[model samples]
Each structure stands twice: as C-alpha cells, then as structure tokens.
Target: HHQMAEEFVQQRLANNKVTIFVKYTCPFCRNALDILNKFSFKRGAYEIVDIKEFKPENELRDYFEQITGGKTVPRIFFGKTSIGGYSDLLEIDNMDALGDILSSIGVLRT
Candidate 1:
C-alpha cells in the first residue's frame, strides 16, 4: 500500500499539474478527497500527494516542511503555492471557495 501510494504521488506530481499533500489516516485528508471527488470537474483532474506513505527521510518531505513549516499530515501545495494543511482546505470548503481556487489553477474544468 505504501509503495502504491508513493507511486501515485510521484505520478500526480509528474502528470497532473496541480498537487496536494495528504496523509492516509487524516480526517481532513479524507474531507479534502471527498470534496475533490464531488467537485464538478473531470475525474483524475488534479494531483494529490499522499504523504503518509512517503518515505520518512525523503527530500520531498524535507522540501514540504521547508515550505509549510508544519511537520505533519495534510500539507497541500498547488504548484508553487503552499495551500496549507487540511484545516485550511476545510475552511475553503465552508466558504465554497475551493472551486474558484482550483479553477484558477486550471485543475477544475467546470
């Protein structure tokens, strides 16, 4: 499962254009995914980095920490923009503002 999650993250980074970091066991991560899944956008429309399964000492994690300063799960990055952790994502959802952001970033088609 870990290997598959790593591969998924790498593929997302390389191919999907937009990226979000998350962990497997995080409730916020689950919320984020549920929101994205329900978004009026195309399937597989955005990239996601599942950080829970990521290697402990990976340069990616180091870079993630350097950018976000939070050493935990659900750190999301959209291209060069650090979108913060899951709580931020939830806030966006509450305001119905997430779609606009995703649209601006070209991740959402509608």
Candidate 2:
C-alpha cells in the first residue's frame, strides 16, 4: 500500500536522531555522504540507508519525496524532519550543525 511507505519512514525517523536516504553513485549523495562518513555517533544518532541497496528504493523515494520535500537523493532527516538534500544538508553539517543535533540528542558518541 502507498500508505505503508509513509508508515515505514515514520518509524525510521521517529526512532532515530537521523535517517538519510541515499544511493551510492549519485554525486549529490556523495556530497552528503562524504560529510556524513567523516563523522561519528551512536547507533541511534547515525542511520543511513543506501537506496541502491534497498530493494524498494523507488517505492520508498517516491513516498519519501512527498513527506520530506526534495528533488533527489541524499534525503536527510533529523528528528523526523527533513532538513533538505545535499546543498541544504551542507548548511547543517559542512560547518558543525550535525554535531549540534547529535549533541542535542545526547547521541554524539564522542
């Protein structure tokens, strides 16, 4: 069901501090990932799923686009809210905002 996609993502973001939907090859995805990969956090703080590896990647992205608002991959979520794609995400982490989120959530691990 279409609703299942929404419900599926709901719990994903709700239960974690961050949930980023990405694919391996997209340069935009790399833009987000390079920054994310450089960071450290607890289990709940960093939850990244490569859409390429996700069998239902198409189904999930179509549904996630509506819920999160985006035009492409690297759909980044923080505390159940979409902060935007790679460019917007840079605003959050390229400097230090990502750690801010984890710090706020107490999952900074370091």
Candidate 3:
C-alpha cells in the first residue's frame, strides 16, 4: 500500500503537479494555499490535497515526517520534491524558481 501511494505521488510529480498537505484553521496553511492560488493562474496543472480531508492524521503525519523531517501544516510536495512549509514555498516563489520549475515540467502553458 505504501509503495502504491508512493508510486501515485511519483506519477503526479512527473506531470508537474503537487500535493499540498494542509489543515483547517491553520494560518500558515491558508497562506500557502493563497500563494498557490495566486501563482496557479500563471502556472496551471497542479494538485492540492488537504491533509485533513485526504488522509488519516497518522498517515499524514508520517508522510510529512518522511518528506519534511517534521510534522507541520502547509507542507507541500511539488511533484516528488518536498517544498517544506509555507515559508519555503514563499522563498521558492520569491526567487521565481517555482515558475521555472513549473515551466520545465510542462505545467506552465508558456
């Protein structure tokens, strides 16, 4: 089952999509989502999976721990690459690297 999940994740990443683990009432989570929404128009073709809705807490925590080395809200996985928490996502966005990555992966139309 774990292998299957990993493989699914791999497939999503290969297409330049993402899985964002977020929890309700989390400011950081909201912020992360906000950022994604803002950039998504410029770079479409991604996925956001709310941890609270998509997976059991334990499973989400375990996945977060493995991907980010800790349990934190707003943990995002850009394809197979872990983008850490909101801060990390913001950093990547600020540097304009996220758009480049999205373009390279065929997510961005342009």
Candidate 4:
C-alpha cells in the first residue's frame, strides 16, 4: 500500500513537467497557483493534483512526508525535484526570479 503511493507520486512526477500536490481547500495552495499564474505558467506545462479531490486521500500526504520532509503542501515540483510550498515559492524574491527558476528547468516558455 505504501509502495503503491510511492509509485503513484512517481507516475505523477513522470507525466508532468511541473506537479503540485495540494489540498483543494488550502489557501496556501491557492496562493501558490495565484503566483504561478502571475508569472504566466500555462496549463499543460504544469499539473495540479488535489489529493483531497483526487484518488489518493491520506496515502499521498503520508508518502510525501518521507520524501519532502514535511507533509504540509502546496508541494511543488519541477520535473522530479520537489521544491517547497507557498512561502518557499515567495522566497524566490519576485516574478522575474520565479520565471528564471522555471526557465532553467525548461518548463517556462516565452
């Protein structure tokens, strides 16, 4: 069961250039998306998997803790690398800095 959760996360990471595992009701998650939108991250470039609304319930958050260190989200990723959450995203400084990060990862296009 735990192993399956790992695979599920891996599959999500494999299929999307950027993947965000979130709870739909989380304002922090909403904030992350809002910031991403400001930087113009287009759909199809990134994917949002709301664990609350998606197939995995507690399984994902539990599994995520092992990898991300803390289960709390807006668990954001670029390719296979798990970056931090909303405040972490904010730490990048500004829109330009955020774009530069995504650009380096080849997820952002002009």
Q: After superposition, how far is residue 13 of candidate 2 from its true place, in Å?
A: 1.7
What's the TM-score of each model vs. the native? 0.67, 0.76, 0.72, 0.81
Best by lDDT: 4
Better of 2 and 4 by lDDT: 4
Q: Which pairs clash in model 4?
A: none
Query: lDDT per prediction?
Result: 0.64, 0.72, 0.67, 0.75
lDDT of the structure predicted as candidate 2: 0.72
Top TM-score prediction, candidate number? 4
Ranking by TM-score: 4, 2, 3, 1
Order the numbered candidates by lDDT, best leading: 4, 2, 3, 1
Candidate 1, which segments miss by more than 4 Å at Cα? 1-16, 40-45, 57-61
The TM-score of candidate 2 is 0.76
Worst 10 residues of 2 by lDDT: 1-10
lDDT of 2 by residue, 51-107 (tens): 665446567778867877764688888777788888887887767777777678655
Candidate 1 whole-model C-alpha lDDT, 0 to 1 = 0.64
Shift of residue 86 alpha carbon in model 2, Å? 0.4
1-110 in candidate 1: lDDT tens per residue?
A: 24443353445552334566776677877877776677654465566665654554365556556667765666666655666777777888899997677777666665
Alpha carbon RMSD to native, model 1 = 4.6
The positional error of residue 52 in candidate 3, measured at the CA in angstroms, is 1.9
